[PDB]
Amino acid sequence: GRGSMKLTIERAALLKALGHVQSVVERRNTIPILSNILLSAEGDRLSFSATDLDMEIIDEGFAQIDVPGQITAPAHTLYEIVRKLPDGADVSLSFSGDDPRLVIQAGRSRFNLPVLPAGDFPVMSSDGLSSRIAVDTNELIRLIDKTRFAISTEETRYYLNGLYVHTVNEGGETKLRAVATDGHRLALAEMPAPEGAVGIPGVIVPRKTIAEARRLMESAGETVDLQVSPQKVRFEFGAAALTSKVIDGAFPDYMRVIPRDNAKILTLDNDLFAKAVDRVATISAEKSRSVKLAVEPGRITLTVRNMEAGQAVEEVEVDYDGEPFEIGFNARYLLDVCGQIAGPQAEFRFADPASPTLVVDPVDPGVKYVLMPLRV
Amino acid sequence: GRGSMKLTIERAALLKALGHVQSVVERRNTIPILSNILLSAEGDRLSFSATDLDMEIIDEGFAQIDVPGQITAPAHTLYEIVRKLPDGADVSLSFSGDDPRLVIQAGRSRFNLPVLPAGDFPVMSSDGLSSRIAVDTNELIRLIDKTRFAISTEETRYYLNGLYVHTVNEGGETKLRAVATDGHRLALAEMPAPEGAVGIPGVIVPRKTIAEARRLMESAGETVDLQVSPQKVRFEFGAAALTSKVIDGAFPDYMRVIPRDNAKILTLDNDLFAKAVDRVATISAEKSRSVKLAVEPGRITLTVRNMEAGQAVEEVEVDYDGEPFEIGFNARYLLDVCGQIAGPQAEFRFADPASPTLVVDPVDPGVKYVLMPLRV
Known part of the structure; x- marks a missing residue:
């Protein structure tokens, strides 16, 4: 049918990874596999992936794997199930045979969910991305939190529905700067540029990417790795990573709208x-x-x-x-x-x-x- | 214009009374005075009243009154204002003159609200009500909490959109009983009848009355006083009271739908x-x-x-x-x-x-x- 898989994973680890990736999954999809999480079991690692085509979140947890394999199953439903399973219970995940369902069991519960093959799951390329740039997690939080409120949510200006991240040479020192505006106000925040940042293109990071990255950042370690290209941005948190398209548009000439001589x-x-x-x-x-x-x-x-x-x-x-x-x-x-x-x-x-x-x-x-x- | 009034009241006391009465006020009214709270200052007592015509909540707090009087002002807005006033600030309430507004001030804040005369505020009669029946607050909570979920919210059966409160002689002992049903299930709860309860008619207490009474009960003392007539019910909590119409309809013959011989x-x-x-x-x-x-x-x-x-x-x-x-x-x-x-x-x-x-x-x-x- 679509191969086989058989593993057990601690509820807390399964729940953590599901919670991390499920957030990107839209509540409706005319393309059903986009509503699914890709589960990929190999060695002692269960990997998780979800996408809305604009971005992909990946995560991983420890598992005890009897039979390696790969499958996709509905993201929200799987997450909601796992939330209800008893605290501390080990969760078995498996499928096999000609008419496979994903079988989830823990304690005295058994759930069967419909599946779609892993080979149909979208692939998000990392081609073109810069080398990884180590960014202080708390500085990255600061850039976001100080500017996020001013990002547009107006459908009529898609190019303002993101955060403009770029480097600036401010009188002999390089800054990593974030600017957001909706045309009614503006917010700017900057930091001394991390080592290796100079060289990156200016990109408009989509507002949903910002939201998702910011949530993942809250539990990260001291560093978040950033990669940038004119087409894509990628945040690596440790076990989790978020890869996303950038907004293909021109960000306004914001330096013209910031007053310099107000007295x-x-x-x-x-x-x-x-x-x-x-x-x-x-x-x-x-x-x-x-x-x-x-x-x-x-x-x-x-x-x-x-x-x-x-x-x-x-x-x-x-x-x-x-x-x-x-x-x-x-x-x-x-x-x-x-x-x-x-x-x-x-x-x-x-x-x-x-x-x-x-x-x-x-x-x-x-x-x-x-x-x-x-x-x- | 509409007389005069001038007093000061502690923020906490003003906020408590406003919070108690505002809940009954509907979020829309084609009749504007129904959106208002009636403020009545006399002696050292500021009384508060609000209504949706089906029911009236009254409350009272201590005030220092320079000039007694009566006025009505918008309930929600007044409440929201008072919520924002600084903790511990004494609040001045006053109005006078030909074009009066209710003047609220505390600290460095001053609010003016439009008013309507107290003489236009609806009057809820207490005529026909039984004498006060002392009910144990926790027993009254129990009657409500054990049955409330089964009250109908379906517009098509108005007579099930309340709680049927009545006395029953259950083989030589009188019970005060509450029954709720929506036609899809049923809940019944009863207690030994409070002293003085026997004699009251069976009434269907509206679901919003139940909600409002239940909320007021949570902070009451050991006793809630109940009065009943075929037209009205009244709950006295201490400083607060709730007087309400009952549902003019026939409650189903519920004893027929409770199975007795399931084996x-x-x-x-x-x-x-x-x-x-x-x-x-x-x-x-x-x-x-x-x-x-x-x-x-x-x-x-x-x-x-x-x-x-x-x-x-x-x-x-x-x-x-x-x-x-x-x-x-x-x-x-x-x-x-x-x-x-x-x-x-x-x-x-x-x-x-x-x-x-x-x-x-x-x-x-x-x-x-x-x-x-x-x-x-």
Whole structure:
């Protein structure tokens, strides 16, 4: 039929690997094998693979293998089954014969699932990729976490639905930089470039790739290996790896939209301010809630209104000695920036009420946020 | 405009009372005052009321009142505001003048909400209600928790969308009994009748009333006071009370659908069995998942299938020495019963595969569950 396979694996190890790879599997597929995990047993290693064609996750666990072989079975169902199996039970996986089903058993339970042959499972090439670049896991987390919120989810601009990862020579030192924008704001984060990074092309890593890599990163060791080409990116975590296409598109010329000479400098207590904004925004249940900042020496007055004659106002003392002005922002966009500020202060740099505004982190010079004002 | 009011109240007390009454307020209302809470300040007491016309919740907290008065303001918005106010802050509530708004302030925040006059707020009469009947809070919780799952949520049978609360003379002793059914199963729970209960009419308490009463009960003292009429029910918790219409309809003759002579008696380990059922059901993501019980002396074999050639089977040892048979149940209906069994054993009483099945709790003779079999 499709050969044979027979092994046992600890539930915890099986569950870990299934949980790692299943996430990439879409909840619908007109192509049924894309709903499946590829199981490949050899030696003392059970390998796992899943894909949505844009990316592939692979993982591996220890197994006791009586008969080596390969098969595919439905990802979600297999995962959900294994979740319900008793804690500590060893799980037998096997199939054989002319009308094979994947047989899962543990304790007094037996499940049979339909299978598709391993030879029909998609193959994701690694051709063209750079050599592996060791990246500090925590630095890689930082690049993602400081910028991820500003990635577009708008179907109408596919080229903004990813994170632009590239190297920059910033006045004699090479930086690995991440930029995300949705056209309504922008986030930038960078680090001194890892050794061996210089040479890689600038790529737009898809937003789902970012999500999946970020989740796998949370449990990785000190290093994540990165490989890049103009077509592909690959993250190696140890036992798990994620290989993905990049977005074939031009990322905007983002340096043009980051203001360099904003001269009105305002410093504030980030937590206090964010709490104020969130508080006043609570007057409204709308999606795109606006907040007005009335800035004067020593203070900012925040105002939000709803459509039903409700009003909220709060005064926040700040460090500012310039000329007064009013400016409007989308409250969520503002709050997103505040949530990424690393220390007690945030520094706003304004020009005039129609101009892009810069936010700087006194703790971390390697991040830069841009907010676009709303007509007030 | 609508008079005046001026008070201060501790945030925690304001938040507690708002949280208690807001739950009854529907998320939409074509009649705007039904979206509002009635605030009534007098002496050192701020009273709170909200309603959906079917029921009214009232609560009260301590306040320092400078100017007594009454007003209504939007329930959800007021609650959400108060949630965001700083922990420990005293909250000022006030209004006055020709174009009044409810002014809420705490710390450096000020909110203005639109108001409607207190004289337009609906009045819920307590006329016709019995005298207060003291009920043990934990017994009242038990009546609800053991039966609530079997209340209908089907729009097509409004008379099953509540809990039938009534007294019964069960061979010389009066019982307060709760019965719920959706026509697909049934749950019954009873207790020795509280002193003063005999005399009350049988009423169908609406499902949303049950939900709301049950939530308020969780923090009550040792007693909840109950009053009943053919039109209304009222729960008094202490500071809070819930007054509600009852469902104007005939509850089914439920004694006819509870089997009395089922002779095939099967005893099982409830937790083990429920875990088995849940495990095998996990083969399927369908709504109305069926499970087959193949019963023989000493054992039950459980089988579930999905629509995609998947199968799950588990054997559970049980105490049974009768003749073998197969029977089908909705897995969720079965699991609902198992979740209410109080101790390690559950006792099933079967007749034949087409007959209603009884479940008995060896720990608690005051509950009775009925499951209706599916054609297998």
